[PDB]
Amino acid sequence: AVKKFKPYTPSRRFMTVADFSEITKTEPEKSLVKPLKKTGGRNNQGRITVRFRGGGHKRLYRIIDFKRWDKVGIPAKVAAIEYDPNRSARIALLHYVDGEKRYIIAPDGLQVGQQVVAGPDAPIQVGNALPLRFIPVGTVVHAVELEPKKGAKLARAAGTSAQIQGREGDYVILRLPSGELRKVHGECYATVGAVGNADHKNIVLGKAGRSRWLGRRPHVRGAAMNPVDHPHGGGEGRAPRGRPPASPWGWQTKGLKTRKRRKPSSRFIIARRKK
Amino acid sequence: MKRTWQPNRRKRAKTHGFRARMRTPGGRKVLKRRRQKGRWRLTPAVRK
RNA sequence: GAGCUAGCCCUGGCCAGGGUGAAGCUGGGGUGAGACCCAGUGGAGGCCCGAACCGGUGGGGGAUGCAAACCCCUCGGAUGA
RNA sequence: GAAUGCCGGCAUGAGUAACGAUAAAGAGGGUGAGAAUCCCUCUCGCCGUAAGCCCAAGGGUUCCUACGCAAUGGUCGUCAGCGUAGGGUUAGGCGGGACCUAAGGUGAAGCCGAAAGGCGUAGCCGAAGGGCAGCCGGUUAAUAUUCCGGCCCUUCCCGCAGGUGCGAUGGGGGGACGCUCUAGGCUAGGGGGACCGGAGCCAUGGACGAGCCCGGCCAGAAGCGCAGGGUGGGAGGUAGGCAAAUCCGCCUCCCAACAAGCUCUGCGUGGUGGGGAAGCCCGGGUGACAACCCCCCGAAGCCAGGGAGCCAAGAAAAGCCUCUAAGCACAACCUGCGGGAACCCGUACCGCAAACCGACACAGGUGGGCGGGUGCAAGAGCACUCAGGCGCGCGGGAGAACCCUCGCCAAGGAACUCUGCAAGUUGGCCCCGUAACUUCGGGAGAAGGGGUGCUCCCUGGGGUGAUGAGCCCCGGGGAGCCGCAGUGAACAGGCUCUGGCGACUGUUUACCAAAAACACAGCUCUCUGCGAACUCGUAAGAGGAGGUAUAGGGAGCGACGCUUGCCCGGUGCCGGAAGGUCAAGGGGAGGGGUGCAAGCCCCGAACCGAAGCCCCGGUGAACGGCGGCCGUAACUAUAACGGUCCUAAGGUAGCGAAAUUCCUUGUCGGGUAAGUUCCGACCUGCACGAAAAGCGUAACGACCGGAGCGCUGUCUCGGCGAGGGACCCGGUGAAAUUGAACUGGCCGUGAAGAUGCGGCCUACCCGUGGCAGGACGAAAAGACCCCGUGGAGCUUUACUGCAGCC
RNA sequence: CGAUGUCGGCUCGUCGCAUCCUGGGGCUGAAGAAGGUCCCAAGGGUUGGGCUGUUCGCCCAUUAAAGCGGCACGCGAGCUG
RNA sequence: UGGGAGAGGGUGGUGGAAUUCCCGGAGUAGCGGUGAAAUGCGCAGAUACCGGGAGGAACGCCGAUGGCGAAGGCAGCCACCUGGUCCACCCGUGACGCUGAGGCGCGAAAGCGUGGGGAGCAAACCGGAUUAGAUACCCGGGUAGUCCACGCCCUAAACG
RNA sequence: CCGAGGGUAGGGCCCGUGACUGGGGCGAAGUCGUAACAAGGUAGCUGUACCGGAAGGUGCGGCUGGAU
């Protein structure tokens, strides 16, 4: 449940912060964090290839176990639930009876002190990772592999979830967080339940500086620029777009579909997305 | 005011130095070119 | 050619002093239990005043200048984009 | 002889401007050919969170000493950062290397590109980050944590003794981390003393005093003490840490538990070794057997890897410890002791500046540390001062105009002006008090007032100590004193009402614009299923993201509140397996050339044949657009109402002479003595209008308007005074400009505005201080404007191509 | 066009006279006072404010009067902007 | 003490019918709609039929003139949690009662906030008719909303 | 010392008046439609919402003070 502030500054009027009330441990596991090499949006050429990036808080990357089929049949206790500045969700620290320690994305409802497990034999319980073909039809799952053994690729963001709708052959039908209907292979892993921290979307940043804390530098509108810079530049005074609204590089940015038409995964897209 | 010349020995050697010039084609032509002209110095002297 | 300038990356450093007094916590009141009220404690903030520092608002001087952008008075920010 | 020609020489302006901060000078003595300028002394003044000191960068001998003054020095010069010559920089411990990693750079493997080359894991390189052993004093003209003295310590090799399963690039631990606030105890630093040490001093009316002046420490190994940091012990199991493992990790048991113990630091003490003032006497020497004690204030530093809270969630790697593997256990490693060994480079000097960056000995620029005392509420603010450093490398005079900076002003008080521009006013602290409105925070330092010094007297609590005295910190009450005036100097808001625009803190045209512009949290649309979209790249490869639709790209709007209407005909976009058109290709009716001929060779109809376009739909917070004439109400007027024409549909709510209104100073109302502005209304809106958003909105603004109070040299209307210049003398001595010049007025003439021509008038020759009307004065081959089949940026349903995409 | 700076203001004036006032006149539909209109006359004078960048104009309060023009729409090597 | 009846309330589950859409098959020239029509939909394969899937909302028969609640109101079915009520016994307390200005709470629908959901329905709106007009009634579309969670609003022909 | 009151600055309440504006009442014979009273020709009324020259219409839920 998001936390409001009294208006003792102009920005405190609307600024909201997470309640952080599910976190049980406040510093990262030394053996599972590594330096997160900030880019600024520059590539190996040195060129801004993604604009308005940089200047965020320093971060360490928590190594997250996106396979889990590494360790079929070895249970693990939920030792803690922690903050992770690299993703919307929270992360959960697992202590395996193996003695090994890993992080997973924290599903909604997971409690410290519960034991989770992974594999075809697993119970249909929050935090269990099974191949997709062994979860009953209708079960809400997250952290889903797109391809067998290739790694959890879908429904990783705070609050998201895919739902199992039915089966066809070696393949399952998932309703993704976008509402598309895609066929995913049955041997792909997924974790029972939805990701936690659903309140994440109701956060009200509150002021410009908070975006600067996330590495987000200011966006500059096309209309505010000059013709050397953007299709929407120029004009004496303000101005409407005066052409179909365009990106910096000329392409149209209202409705123009951009998925590649012959892409092979199209055989596996049953229906495009919702809303 | 702060002007354009802010001498820095390490910046000087690392930018115009002999080893900087040999590492690229345009650099070796510079050295060849200044050697053909008979420059007493092929490169800016910096004290390291 | 980025030793000027612009942005980002890595690593360090700096920000006198005062002022305001958020949540929280505690106690008291309240109630079926609450909400909530009062006091104290607390020390929040692109919060307030003001040096260093960063700026350059208005005026005056300067105009073969002390200076190819300076000087005086005044003025903005000063825990933060 | 001319090219605003080129190179050089030399003139003119001219003995003119200037001589670079208005911090300031005077005299005596010395030296010397020569002295305002060098040296010495006394007096004066300036900086003192600096204008003093120490590091770093950069500079590169500028350092020190002798000897010089042609040039350099804005004057001078005997001086000097100048000339000449000699001298000067000393390290196992400081900094860098023989150590580690960060971004980045490079790069065995590998990948990519016509060539050049671009990438790329490890690895390597890479520092002001990690790591690691030196403190105090003396010494030289010039170096010192470097030399010397004292007391300490590190690594490497070898040896000795004790001990132990020893052994690594491998496993593990640790190293290892944010922001704000902050505890306890110290230390640096400081204040005081009636105590201790000291050469002296008694003045000019008084004082021989509990007098004045001065100074009362620094470093130090073990131990010890105080304060802190760090750290569970044992056992059993064990599949995880890419081999192993007794280590680590996980599970159980026992024990311990604010502890303690073990360990590591700071501080204190400490053998020991140092230092040691004023004054006096020519840097030294004396003082001096110097003394070296007590109380108080007290860090931002130290203990430290301390504590708490918060969200934006805060390097790596080596050193180091531990585990074992090959191996090896005559080894090896650990521990203590002993001897020996310990290399390269930097070290002078300047360093907020005359030695660095600005062409200059240039009022500019330059990162880190130290930065004393008093008082002013605090402080790095302000004034004066310590240490220490300076008086800014032309002076002497005079005492005009005028200019700059500054002080005051009778009466009036914004009448000044585009504008209160500028300058007054106000000004700190303490107490009383404080409105509309509001998002309940604010608005608020609202506004407005009162207090403020000194003496005496009584008294409350706190810190140190002890619970006392002493010192130190916050106060309370009473009675008095002096002045024009008590934050008596210095630093230190004028206020209010009302509108426009932008929510706000921010950002910007380096060097004419700081704004209403950009940004901004927030809202909406749209694309994107991950080898994502999109971006950069020929590619490989990167960014996106070690992210995954609560995410990422693109676009518009811009907190918040109440809202965002009608038009899909056109353009865009999205959907549409029909149809229509449609390229290569397929097909080959049927024609052609040649050959004697088998043949060879050419043209070619229907038909099949993508995307795109046509066509059918949808789509507005997609591009965009949201009517005309005529009539009508029982006074007039105006039309709720009607007729008709056109449209894809004819502007809704709200707002309106407005940042928009042309006619315009619209009209009415308010404010004024008077109001082209302002505010409030009206609405025939030239030419508002709903996310190029509409109407509002508390708070905010060096934004832009209008008004009022306060107060003023802004003004009536100017006066006087100060200093720095201007002026005079000595020194040094520019400049743009310049066809030559023996260079007057009027009325005319002239290429149409004449010193230069005509006629007249006026006028002895040459300067100095002033003023700017002319020399179509100077500067810049007009930026406006046009011309050139000149150029460049930009746009699109101009042309033609290309990338990219299909 | 190898540059003649361009509105208004301020300051400083100088000139013309088709005279706004003051002096002298004729005519009057001049009783007086007051004007009306033409003539002569350029010696001097010709105010302070509100509004607007304004010139101009309107308005307020006075006045003998609140003149109109030229001087590169006089005057930016005199200022403003 | 012991009994019973009930859509009383709250939470979590879960069942079938029907509508809509989507996929496959089959099939052809209309379907839909009305007072009559047109708009609309349909050879680009609709309607009507069968198989499949998804999703939302409501709960047929029972059902009543019934029942429960203080009122507003409450209807598939299951479980849990909870309120009120009536009855038999005549067992306990000893008038502990009645009402109730203020207060507090509850309070249909619509409406508002921030998320979610969205089949059907449907203000606004668009089109087709009717009509003198038709900003209506009727028809074809259609957005809020109706649904869920939390938080507001607090109204009524909230009536017996 | 207190003190009539005078002055300065700021608040509260009432009264009168104001360009313009909002609906209200009244007014023998105005304009537009016809919402209600009969099943008033779509039963009406309702709270609310949205919309429209105007009465009103429509939605959602409620009442019978609805008809046959």
Ligand SMILES: CC[C@H]1OC(=O)[C@H](C)[C@@H](O[C@H]2C[C@@](C)(OC)[C@@H](O)[C@H](C)O2)[C@H](C)[C@@H](O[C@@H]2O[C@H](C)C[C@H](N(C)C)[C@H]2O)[C@](C)(O)C[C@@H](C)C(=O)[C@H](C)[C@@H](O)[C@]1(C)O
């Ligand atoms: C400070 C010192 C500078 O002087 C100025 O700024 C003055 C104040 C300008 O006026 C400024 C300010 C202003 C308002 O002029 C008054 C503006 O109009 C002009 C454009 O520039 C001048 C004099 C301009 O002249 C004017 O240029 C006009 C185009 C035409 C005009 N004249 C021939 C008709 C002429 O005199 C012009 C060109 O800058 C002068 C040229 C030679 C220069 O470039 C010189 C080197 C100047 O930079 C300067 C002397 O250093």
Ligand SMILES: [Mg+2]
């Ligand atoms: Mg808040």
Ligand SMILES: [Mg+2]
């Ligand atoms: Mg509040």
Ligand SMILES: [Mg+2]
């Ligand atoms: Mg959480």
Ligand SMILES: [Mg+2]
């Ligand atoms: Mg690590």
Ligand SMILES: [Mg+2]
């Ligand atoms: Mg990267």
Ligand SMILES: [Mg+2]
């Ligand atoms: Mg790279």
Ligand SMILES: [Mg+2]
């Ligand atoms: Mg490169």
Ligand SMILES: [Mg+2]
């Ligand atoms: Mg490059």
Ligand SMILES: [Mg+2]
């Ligand atoms: Mg980009």
Ligand SMILES: [Mg+2]
């Ligand atoms: Mg970027």
Ligand SMILES: [Mg+2]
């Ligand atoms: Mg997280």
Ligand SMILES: [Mg+2]
């Ligand atoms: Mg994320």
Ligand SMILES: [Mg+2]
């Ligand atoms: Mg798959």
Ligand SMILES: [Mg+2]
């Ligand atoms: Mg948000």
Ligand SMILES: [Mg+2]
């Ligand atoms: Mg961040």
